[PDB]
Coordinates of C-alpha atoms and ligand atoms in Angstrom, one line a residue:
Chain A
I1 CA 130.2 120.5 41.0
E2 CA 131.7 122.7 43.8
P3 CA 135.6 122.4 44.6
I4 CA 136.8 121.1 47.8
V5 CA 139.7 123.1 49.2
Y6 CA 142.0 122.4 51.9
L7 CA 142.1 124.7 55.2
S8 CA 144.4 124.8 58.2
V9 CA 143.9 127.2 60.6
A10 CA 145.3 127.1 64.4
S11 CA 146.6 123.6 63.5
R12 CA 143.2 122.3 63.0
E13 CA 142.6 121.0 59.4
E14 CA 140.0 120.2 57.1
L15 CA 138.8 119.6 53.0
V16 CA 135.7 121.6 52.6
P17 CA 133.7 122.7 49.8
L18 CA 134.8 126.2 48.6
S19 CA 131.8 127.9 50.2
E20 CA 132.6 126.9 53.4
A21 CA 136.4 127.6 53.5
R22 CA 136.7 131.1 55.6
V23 CA 139.6 132.2 57.5
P24 CA 139.5 134.7 60.6
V25 CA 139.4 138.5 59.9
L26 CA 143.0 139.0 61.9
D27 CA 145.0 136.4 59.8
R28 CA 147.9 138.0 58.7
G29 CA 147.5 137.2 55.1
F30 CA 144.8 139.4 55.3
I31 CA 145.8 142.0 57.3
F32 CA 149.5 142.3 56.0
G33 CA 150.1 140.4 53.1
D34 CA 152.3 138.3 54.8
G35 CA 152.7 134.9 53.6
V36 CA 154.0 133.2 50.4
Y37 CA 152.6 131.0 47.6
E38 CA 153.7 128.2 45.5
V39 CA 152.0 126.5 42.6
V40 CA 152.1 122.8 41.1
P41 CA 150.7 121.9 37.9
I42 CA 148.8 118.9 37.7
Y43 CA 148.6 117.1 33.7
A44 CA 146.2 114.5 33.1
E45 CA 146.3 111.6 31.0
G46 CA 142.7 110.5 31.1
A47 CA 142.5 109.5 34.9
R48 CA 146.2 109.3 35.3
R49 CA 147.1 112.7 36.9
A50 CA 150.8 113.5 37.7
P51 CA 151.9 116.5 39.3
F52 CA 154.9 118.2 37.2
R53 CA 158.3 119.3 39.1
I54 CA 156.5 118.7 42.4
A55 CA 160.0 118.5 44.3
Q56 CA 161.5 121.4 42.9
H57 CA 158.3 123.7 43.6
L58 CA 158.0 122.5 47.1
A59 CA 161.6 123.2 47.7
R60 CA 160.9 126.7 46.3
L61 CA 158.0 126.7 48.8
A62 CA 160.4 126.0 52.1
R63 CA 163.0 128.5 51.0
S64 CA 160.1 131.3 50.7
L65 CA 159.0 130.1 54.3
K66 CA 162.7 130.5 55.7
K67 CA 163.3 133.8 54.0
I68 CA 160.3 135.4 55.8
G69 CA 160.7 133.6 59.1
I70 CA 157.4 131.2 59.0
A71 CA 158.0 127.9 60.3
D72 CA 157.4 125.1 57.3
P73 CA 154.3 123.0 58.7
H74 CA 155.1 120.0 56.5
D75 CA 158.2 118.0 55.6
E76 CA 158.3 117.2 51.7
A77 CA 156.1 114.0 52.4
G78 CA 153.6 115.9 54.1
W79 CA 153.2 118.6 51.5
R80 CA 153.0 116.0 48.7
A81 CA 150.3 113.8 50.7
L82 CA 148.5 117.2 51.3
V83 CA 148.7 117.7 47.5
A84 CA 147.6 114.3 46.8
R85 CA 144.4 114.2 48.8
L86 CA 143.7 117.5 47.6
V87 CA 143.8 116.7 43.8
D88 CA 142.1 113.1 44.7
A89 CA 139.1 114.8 46.5
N90 CA 138.8 117.1 43.2
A91 CA 138.8 114.1 41.0
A92 CA 135.1 114.6 39.9
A93 CA 135.2 118.6 40.0
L94 CA 137.9 118.8 37.3
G95 CA 136.9 115.3 35.3
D96 CA 139.0 113.0 33.1
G97 CA 141.5 114.4 30.6
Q98 CA 141.6 117.8 32.8
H99 CA 144.6 119.5 33.5
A100 CA 144.7 121.0 37.0
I101 CA 146.9 123.8 38.8
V102 CA 147.4 123.6 42.5
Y103 CA 147.7 126.5 44.7
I104 CA 149.3 126.7 48.0
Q105 CA 149.3 129.5 50.3
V106 CA 150.7 129.8 53.9
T107 CA 150.5 132.8 56.1
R108 CA 152.0 133.9 59.5
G109 CA 148.8 133.1 61.1
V110 CA 146.1 135.0 63.2
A111 CA 146.9 137.4 65.9
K112 CA 146.3 141.1 67.3
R113 CA 147.0 143.4 64.7
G114 CA 150.8 144.6 65.3
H115 CA 153.2 144.8 62.3
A116 CA 156.4 142.7 63.9
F117 CA 156.1 138.7 64.2
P118 CA 153.5 137.8 67.1
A119 CA 154.9 135.5 69.9
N120 CA 152.4 132.6 69.3
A121 CA 150.8 132.9 66.0
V122 CA 150.2 129.5 64.1
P123 CA 150.6 129.7 60.3
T124 CA 147.4 129.1 57.8
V125 CA 147.6 126.8 55.2
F126 CA 145.2 127.3 52.4
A127 CA 145.4 125.0 49.1
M128 CA 143.0 124.8 46.1
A129 CA 143.0 122.6 42.9
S130 CA 141.5 124.2 39.8
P131 CA 141.0 123.4 36.0
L132 CA 144.1 124.6 33.9
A133 CA 143.8 125.7 30.3
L134 CA 147.1 125.9 28.8
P135 CA 147.8 128.5 26.2
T136 CA 146.0 127.2 22.7
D137 CA 147.8 126.1 19.3
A138 CA 146.6 129.2 17.9
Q139 CA 148.2 131.3 20.5
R140 CA 151.7 129.3 20.2
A141 CA 151.4 129.9 16.3
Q142 CA 150.6 133.6 16.6
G143 CA 152.3 134.7 19.5
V144 CA 151.2 137.1 21.9
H145 CA 151.1 140.7 22.4
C146 CA 153.0 142.5 25.6
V147 CA 153.0 146.0 26.6
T148 CA 155.9 147.9 28.7
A149 CA 155.6 149.9 31.9
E150 CA 157.7 151.3 34.5
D151 CA 157.8 148.6 37.2
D152 CA 163.2 137.3 45.5
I153 CA 160.0 135.9 46.8
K154 CA 156.8 134.5 46.2
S155 CA 154.9 136.6 48.8
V156 CA 151.3 137.2 48.6
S157 CA 151.8 141.0 49.0
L158 CA 150.7 141.2 45.2
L159 CA 148.9 144.7 44.8
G160 CA 152.0 145.7 42.2
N161 CA 151.4 142.7 40.3
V162 CA 147.4 143.1 40.2
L163 CA 148.0 146.5 39.0
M164 CA 150.5 145.4 35.9
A165 CA 147.9 142.5 35.4
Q166 CA 145.0 145.0 34.9
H167 CA 147.0 147.4 32.9
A168 CA 148.0 144.6 30.3
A169 CA 143.9 143.7 30.2
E170 CA 143.0 147.3 29.5
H171 CA 145.5 147.4 26.8
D172 CA 144.3 143.9 25.0
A173 CA 147.7 142.7 26.0
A174 CA 148.5 139.0 27.7
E175 CA 151.0 140.5 29.9
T176 CA 153.3 143.7 30.9
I177 CA 156.7 143.7 30.9
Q178 CA 158.0 146.1 33.4
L179 CA 161.2 148.3 33.4
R180 CA 162.9 149.6 36.2
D181 CA 165.6 152.4 35.7
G182 CA 165.8 151.3 31.9
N183 CA 166.1 147.4 32.6
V184 CA 163.7 144.6 31.9
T185 CA 162.2 143.3 35.2
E186 CA 159.7 140.6 35.0
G187 CA 156.2 140.3 34.0
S188 CA 153.0 140.6 36.3
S189 CA 152.9 137.0 36.6
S190 CA 155.7 135.5 34.2
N191 CA 159.3 135.5 33.7
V192 CA 160.7 137.5 30.8
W193 CA 163.6 136.3 28.5
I194 CA 164.9 137.6 25.2
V195 CA 166.8 135.7 22.2
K196 CA 169.7 137.6 20.5
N197 CA 172.0 136.1 18.0
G198 CA 170.9 132.8 19.2
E199 CA 171.7 133.6 23.0
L200 CA 169.2 133.0 25.9
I201 CA 169.1 136.3 28.1
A202 CA 167.4 136.8 31.3
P203 CA 167.5 139.9 34.1
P204 CA 170.3 138.8 36.6
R205 CA 169.0 136.2 39.6
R206 CA 167.6 127.3 42.7
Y207 CA 164.4 126.9 40.8
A208 CA 165.7 127.1 37.2
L209 CA 163.6 124.9 34.8
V210 CA 164.0 127.1 31.6
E211 CA 167.8 127.3 32.4
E212 CA 167.6 123.6 33.0
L213 CA 165.7 123.4 29.4
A214 CA 168.3 125.7 27.7
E215 CA 171.1 123.7 28.8
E216 CA 169.4 120.2 27.3
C217 CA 169.2 122.3 24.1
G218 CA 172.8 123.3 24.4
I219 CA 171.4 126.9 24.0
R220 CA 173.7 129.5 25.9
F221 CA 172.3 131.1 28.6
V222 CA 173.5 134.6 30.1
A223 CA 171.6 136.5 33.0
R224 CA 172.5 140.1 32.5
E225 CA 170.7 143.4 32.5
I226 CA 168.3 144.1 29.2
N227 CA 167.9 147.6 28.7
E228 CA 164.8 148.8 26.8
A229 CA 166.4 149.1 23.4
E230 CA 167.8 145.6 23.6
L231 CA 164.0 144.3 24.4
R232 CA 162.7 146.2 21.3
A233 CA 165.6 144.9 19.1
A234 CA 165.4 141.3 20.1
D235 CA 165.2 138.5 17.8
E236 CA 162.9 136.8 20.1
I237 CA 160.8 137.6 23.5
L238 CA 159.5 134.9 25.7
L239 CA 157.2 134.5 29.0
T240 CA 157.4 131.8 31.1
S241 CA 155.1 130.4 34.2
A242 CA 153.8 127.4 35.4
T243 CA 150.5 128.1 33.8
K244 CA 151.6 129.4 30.2
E245 CA 154.7 127.0 30.0
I246 CA 156.4 128.9 27.3
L247 CA 154.5 131.4 24.8
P248 CA 156.5 133.6 22.2
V249 CA 156.0 137.4 22.5
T250 CA 155.6 138.6 18.4
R251 CA 154.1 142.2 19.2
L252 CA 155.6 144.8 21.8
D253 CA 153.6 148.0 22.3
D254 CA 151.7 147.5 18.7
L255 CA 155.6 146.9 17.1
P256 CA 156.3 143.4 15.6
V257 CA 159.2 141.6 17.7
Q258 CA 161.6 141.0 14.5
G259 CA 159.3 139.4 11.9
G260 CA 156.4 139.1 14.0
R261 CA 156.8 135.2 14.2
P262 CA 157.9 132.9 16.8
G263 CA 161.6 132.1 16.5
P264 CA 163.6 128.8 17.0
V265 CA 164.8 129.3 20.7
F266 CA 161.0 129.4 21.3
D267 CA 160.5 126.0 19.4
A268 CA 163.3 124.5 20.6
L269 CA 162.4 125.4 24.5
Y270 CA 158.9 124.3 23.8
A271 CA 159.8 120.8 22.5
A272 CA 162.1 120.5 25.6
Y273 CA 159.4 121.5 27.9
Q274 CA 156.8 118.6 26.5
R275 CA 159.6 116.1 26.7
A276 CA 160.1 117.0 30.3
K277 CA 156.4 116.5 30.9
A278 CA 156.2 113.5 28.7
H279 CA 159.1 112.0 30.9
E280 CA 157.3 112.6 34.1
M281 CA 154.2 111.1 32.7
Chain B
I1 CA 134.7 141.9 77.2
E2 CA 135.3 140.7 73.2
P3 CA 135.7 143.0 70.8
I4 CA 132.7 143.4 68.1
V5 CA 133.7 144.2 64.5
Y6 CA 132.1 145.0 61.0
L7 CA 132.4 142.6 58.1
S8 CA 131.0 143.1 54.6
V9 CA 131.5 140.2 52.4
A10 CA 129.6 139.9 48.8
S11 CA 127.0 142.8 49.9
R12 CA 126.2 140.9 53.1
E13 CA 127.1 143.1 56.2
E14 CA 127.2 142.3 59.9
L15 CA 128.4 143.7 63.2
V16 CA 129.5 140.1 65.1
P17 CA 132.1 139.4 68.2
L18 CA 135.6 139.2 66.8
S19 CA 135.8 135.6 67.1
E20 CA 132.9 135.0 65.0
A21 CA 134.2 137.3 62.0
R22 CA 135.5 135.3 59.0
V23 CA 136.0 135.9 55.5
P24 CA 136.1 133.6 52.3
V25 CA 139.8 131.9 51.3
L26 CA 139.4 133.6 47.9
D27 CA 139.1 137.2 49.2
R28 CA 141.4 139.4 47.2
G29 CA 142.7 140.8 50.5
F30 CA 144.0 137.1 51.5
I31 CA 145.3 136.1 48.3
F32 CA 146.7 139.3 46.7
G33 CA 147.3 141.9 49.3
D34 CA 144.9 143.6 46.9
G35 CA 143.2 146.2 49.4
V36 CA 143.9 149.4 51.2
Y37 CA 143.6 150.4 54.9
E38 CA 142.9 153.8 57.1
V39 CA 142.9 154.4 60.6
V40 CA 140.6 156.8 62.6
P41 CA 141.8 157.6 66.2
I42 CA 138.9 157.6 68.9
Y43 CA 139.9 160.0 72.1
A44 CA 137.8 159.8 75.2
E45 CA 136.7 162.2 77.8
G46 CA 135.5 159.7 80.2
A47 CA 132.4 158.5 78.6
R48 CA 132.9 160.9 75.4
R49 CA 134.3 159.6 72.7
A50 CA 135.2 161.9 69.7
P51 CA 136.9 161.0 66.2
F52 CA 140.1 162.8 65.6
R53 CA 140.7 164.3 62.2
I54 CA 137.8 162.1 60.7
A55 CA 137.0 164.3 57.5
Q56 CA 140.7 164.1 56.7
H57 CA 141.2 160.5 57.2
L58 CA 138.2 159.6 55.1
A59 CA 139.3 161.7 52.3
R60 CA 142.9 159.7 52.3
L61 CA 140.7 156.2 52.3
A62 CA 138.7 157.6 49.4
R63 CA 141.8 158.3 47.3
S64 CA 143.5 155.3 48.3
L65 CA 140.5 153.2 46.8
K66 CA 140.4 155.5 43.7
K67 CA 144.1 155.2 43.4
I68 CA 143.7 151.7 43.1
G69 CA 140.6 151.5 41.4
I70 CA 138.2 149.9 43.8
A71 CA 134.5 151.2 43.5
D72 CA 134.3 153.1 47.1
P73 CA 131.4 151.5 48.7
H74 CA 130.2 154.6 51.0
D75 CA 130.2 158.4 50.6
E76 CA 131.8 160.2 53.4
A77 CA 128.5 159.9 55.3
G78 CA 127.8 156.3 55.0
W79 CA 131.7 156.0 56.3
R80 CA 130.9 158.7 59.2
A81 CA 128.0 156.5 59.8
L82 CA 130.0 153.1 59.8
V83 CA 132.2 154.6 62.3
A84 CA 129.8 155.9 64.5
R85 CA 128.1 152.2 64.8
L86 CA 131.4 150.5 65.4
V87 CA 132.8 152.7 68.3
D88 CA 129.0 152.9 70.0
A89 CA 129.0 148.8 69.8
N90 CA 132.4 148.8 71.6
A91 CA 131.6 151.2 74.2
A92 CA 131.3 148.7 76.9
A93 CA 134.3 146.5 75.8
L94 CA 136.5 149.9 75.7
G95 CA 135.3 151.1 79.1
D96 CA 134.9 154.8 79.9
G97 CA 138.2 157.1 79.6
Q98 CA 139.3 154.4 77.0
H99 CA 140.9 155.8 74.0
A100 CA 140.4 153.5 70.8
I101 CA 141.9 153.3 67.4
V102 CA 139.4 152.2 64.3
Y103 CA 141.3 150.2 61.6
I104 CA 139.4 150.4 58.3
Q105 CA 140.2 147.9 55.5
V106 CA 138.8 147.6 52.0
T107 CA 139.5 145.0 49.6
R108 CA 138.6 144.4 45.8
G109 CA 136.6 141.3 47.0
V110 CA 136.1 137.7 46.2
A111 CA 136.5 135.8 43.2
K112 CA 138.2 133.3 41.2
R113 CA 142.5 133.5 41.6
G114 CA 143.4 135.8 38.9
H115 CA 145.7 138.8 38.7
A116 CA 143.6 141.3 36.9
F117 CA 140.4 143.1 38.4
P118 CA 137.6 140.5 38.4
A119 CA 134.5 141.7 36.8
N120 CA 132.0 140.8 39.4
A121 CA 133.8 141.1 42.9
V122 CA 132.1 143.3 45.3
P123 CA 134.4 145.2 47.4
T124 CA 135.1 143.8 51.3
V125 CA 134.6 145.7 54.5
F126 CA 136.1 145.1 57.8
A127 CA 136.3 147.5 60.6
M128 CA 137.4 147.3 64.2
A129 CA 137.5 149.6 67.1
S130 CA 140.3 148.7 69.5
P131 CA 141.8 150.2 72.5
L132 CA 144.6 152.5 72.1
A133 CA 147.4 152.9 74.9
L134 CA 149.5 156.5 73.8
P135 CA 153.0 156.2 74.7
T136 CA 153.8 156.7 78.2
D137 CA 154.9 160.3 79.8
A138 CA 158.3 158.3 80.5
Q139 CA 158.6 157.3 77.0
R140 CA 158.1 160.9 76.2
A141 CA 160.5 162.0 78.4
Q142 CA 163.2 159.6 77.7
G143 CA 162.6 159.3 74.1
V144 CA 162.8 156.0 71.9
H145 CA 165.4 154.2 69.8
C146 CA 165.4 153.8 66.3
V147 CA 167.5 151.5 64.0
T148 CA 168.4 152.2 60.2
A149 CA 168.1 149.9 57.2
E150 CA 168.1 149.7 53.5
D151 CA 164.5 150.5 52.5
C152 CA 155.3 153.6 47.2
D153 CA 152.4 156.3 48.1
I154 CA 149.6 153.6 48.1
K155 CA 148.4 152.9 52.0
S156 CA 148.0 149.1 50.9
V157 CA 147.5 145.9 52.9
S158 CA 150.4 144.5 50.6
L159 CA 152.8 145.3 53.8
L160 CA 155.2 142.0 53.7
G161 CA 158.0 145.0 53.5
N162 CA 156.7 146.7 56.3
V163 CA 156.3 143.7 58.5
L164 CA 159.9 142.8 57.9
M165 CA 161.1 146.0 58.9
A166 CA 159.2 146.3 62.0
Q167 CA 160.5 142.8 62.8
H168 CA 163.9 144.3 62.4
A169 CA 163.6 147.0 64.9
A170 CA 162.3 144.2 67.6
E171 CA 165.2 142.0 67.1
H172 CA 167.4 145.0 67.9
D173 CA 165.3 145.9 70.8
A174 CA 164.2 149.5 69.0
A175 CA 160.8 151.2 68.5
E176 CA 161.2 151.5 64.7
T177 CA 163.2 150.9 61.9
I178 CA 164.3 154.4 59.6
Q179 CA 164.6 153.1 56.1
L180 CA 167.2 154.8 53.8
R181 CA 167.2 154.2 49.9
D182 CA 170.1 155.8 47.9
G183 CA 171.5 156.9 51.3
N184 CA 168.4 159.1 51.8
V185 CA 165.8 158.6 54.5
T186 CA 162.4 157.3 53.4
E187 CA 160.1 156.2 56.3
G188 CA 159.3 154.0 59.2
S189 CA 157.9 150.4 58.9
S190 CA 154.5 152.3 60.2
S191 CA 155.5 156.0 61.0
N192 CA 156.7 159.0 59.1
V193 CA 160.3 160.1 60.2
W194 CA 161.4 164.0 60.4
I195 CA 164.6 165.7 61.5
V196 CA 165.0 169.2 62.8
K197 CA 168.3 171.1 62.0
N198 CA 168.8 174.5 62.9
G199 CA 165.3 174.9 64.2
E200 CA 164.1 173.9 60.8
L201 CA 161.5 171.1 60.4
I202 CA 162.4 168.4 57.4
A203 CA 160.6 165.6 56.0
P204 CA 161.6 163.4 53.2
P205 CA 160.1 164.7 49.9
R206 CA 157.1 162.2 48.2
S207 CA 156.7 161.7 44.8
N208 CA 155.1 165.1 43.9
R209 CA 153.9 168.3 45.8
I210 CA 150.3 167.0 45.9
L211 CA 151.4 163.7 47.9
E212 CA 153.5 165.6 50.3
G213 CA 150.3 168.0 51.3
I214 CA 148.1 165.1 52.0
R215 CA 150.8 163.4 53.9
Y216 CA 151.9 166.1 55.5
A217 CA 148.9 168.0 56.6
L218 CA 148.7 167.7 60.4
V219 CA 152.0 168.5 60.9
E220 CA 152.4 171.1 58.4
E221 CA 149.5 172.5 60.4
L222 CA 151.0 172.1 63.6
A223 CA 154.5 173.6 62.5
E224 CA 152.6 176.8 61.2
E225 CA 150.7 177.0 64.5
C226 CA 154.3 176.9 66.1
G227 CA 155.9 179.4 63.7
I228 CA 158.5 176.7 62.9
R229 CA 159.6 176.5 59.4
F230 CA 159.0 173.2 57.2
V231 CA 160.4 172.1 54.1
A232 CA 160.3 168.6 52.3
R233 CA 163.7 167.8 51.3
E234 CA 165.9 164.9 51.0
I235 CA 167.7 163.6 54.4
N236 CA 170.8 161.9 53.4
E237 CA 172.1 159.5 56.1
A238 CA 174.9 161.8 57.5
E239 CA 172.1 164.5 58.0
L240 CA 170.2 162.4 59.8
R241 CA 173.1 161.2 61.9
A242 CA 173.9 164.9 62.8
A243 CA 170.3 166.1 63.3
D244 CA 169.4 168.1 66.1
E245 CA 166.2 166.1 66.7
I246 CA 164.7 163.2 65.2
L247 CA 160.9 162.7 65.2
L248 CA 158.1 160.0 64.7
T249 CA 154.7 160.5 63.9
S250 CA 151.6 158.2 63.4
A251 CA 148.0 157.7 64.3
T252 CA 149.1 155.4 67.4
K253 CA 152.5 157.5 68.5
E254 CA 151.2 161.0 68.0
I255 CA 154.6 162.6 68.0
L256 CA 157.6 160.9 69.7
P257 CA 161.2 162.0 70.1
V258 CA 164.0 159.6 68.6
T259 CA 166.8 160.1 71.2
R260 CA 168.9 157.3 70.2
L261 CA 169.8 156.0 66.7
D262 CA 171.8 152.7 66.1
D263 CA 172.9 152.5 69.6
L264 CA 174.1 156.4 69.7
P265 CA 172.8 159.2 71.5
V266 CA 171.0 161.9 69.0
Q267 CA 172.5 165.2 70.4
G268 CA 172.5 165.2 74.2
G269 CA 170.0 162.1 74.3
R270 CA 167.1 164.6 75.4
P271 CA 163.8 165.2 73.6
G272 CA 164.4 168.9 72.2
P273 CA 162.4 172.4 72.2
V274 CA 160.5 171.7 68.5
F275 CA 159.4 168.4 69.9
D276 CA 158.2 170.2 72.8
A277 CA 156.0 172.4 70.9
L278 CA 154.8 170.3 68.3
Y279 CA 153.5 167.8 70.9
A280 CA 151.7 170.6 72.9
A281 CA 150.2 171.8 69.7
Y282 CA 149.3 168.3 69.2
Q283 CA 147.5 168.3 72.4
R284 CA 145.7 171.6 71.6
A285 CA 144.2 170.2 68.5
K286 CA 142.7 167.3 70.2
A287 CA 141.3 169.2 73.1
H288 CA 139.7 171.7 70.7
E289 CA 138.1 168.9 68.4
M290 CA 137.0 167.5 72.0
Ligands
CA301 CA1 148.1 120.4 18.8

């Protein structure tokens, strides 16, 4: 019934029901958005559950922590055990055959409000395991609609992304593709790619699953600025994230992308994605 | 002894001791930095306490909420009342003559994690009243030291960038980091930056004149009372380093003179006449409201 979550505040840890998990009001994640997050997908085959790419996800988490000066509270083994206990404790909540997504957040901790790093704060850690519903077959068959709007760490200072996500909802679209000074940046909660003349293109920059899949398929990858015209004239437009896997974008601001049908680089990357998941299960 | 704070979560409200105030983990303030804040100075004449420019602080709070679509949980009177209950509840823990600063934070509330606005979340309100030590008579005589670094108009709690810049100042033994983007002055990590050049007061431009008037209202008022011309105009890095005076303002600092910059003196190293006048004007604004 109720989700069970993990919370560590002032070095005290507990797995508790969601309705009992609360953090002190002076936690810097709440006061300042001063924290980082990472996600790990957990794919289910009956009662067999297996994290996908947990090493690479945890390595990006350690990097985000260091980039903002926050003491990493666990080594890799400690993080994996924290994830395994959390997933175990939600076995009933989730149920057999149910994929999950694990969300991990670490903030600089609790102290008197002052912008600079406090001398003696201990990091807060929050994690939870939620049901994951992947995009449907129909969605992959039809593709998704994106809109555009004016726009290197996974921080929780996310107001910008919240606003662009709301913008996409208000426009009946799956995602807002952002443009800064005429060039593509990213989605509100996804990475954006285009295909042109058989070449996979992303904006200029490691966690790099999509590049690894492109390398596997023998698809050439270039990292360069993608301007608004090149976006609108793409052969294909793609979204990627832990929860979306890869989705084809077939409408962009009410105009069709190319023929308005998912293309072959999408197909190739999607199949290579699923083989990497089979490999791990 | 211990500060007493206001917390409203899922339509339940309380005044509780700081150490008893906790928010749900799925609050979007904690998960997404999805909220706004506003601070109100409370000045003390003995046991007498008075909020400074409460109407203007509360108008900015309301704008901040409207700007990012959070339903404002109070009209102005509701907010006024909330600030009074809170200050009154901390009278004893503050003590006589002790100035305070009220911090109000409003987030979009608690819900299942998803980026877009949740249908049923109700905004969370947190407020506290903390002792305020104004910059000393010394600090005003010596002036303060800023550094520069490489660097829009929402007062949000997505403040990681500001945190990093504040820490950069601390690491270089400086009171503030003055940010530059494209070679032009933006702002401090938690303060607004001004320069004086040939007796004219200059502030960086904002996105449009409306936002400039909201942001600069108090200093614009002080400058007018002093007969000091003010303009909102780009300050390039060389203009910043050649300034006659450099100034910081915020709710906690009031106005301060910057007399050193990246370890070099600002002119003589002495606070200057436009600072003196504005500071005096600031103090007459306080006295008047008190
Ligand atoms: Ca199928």
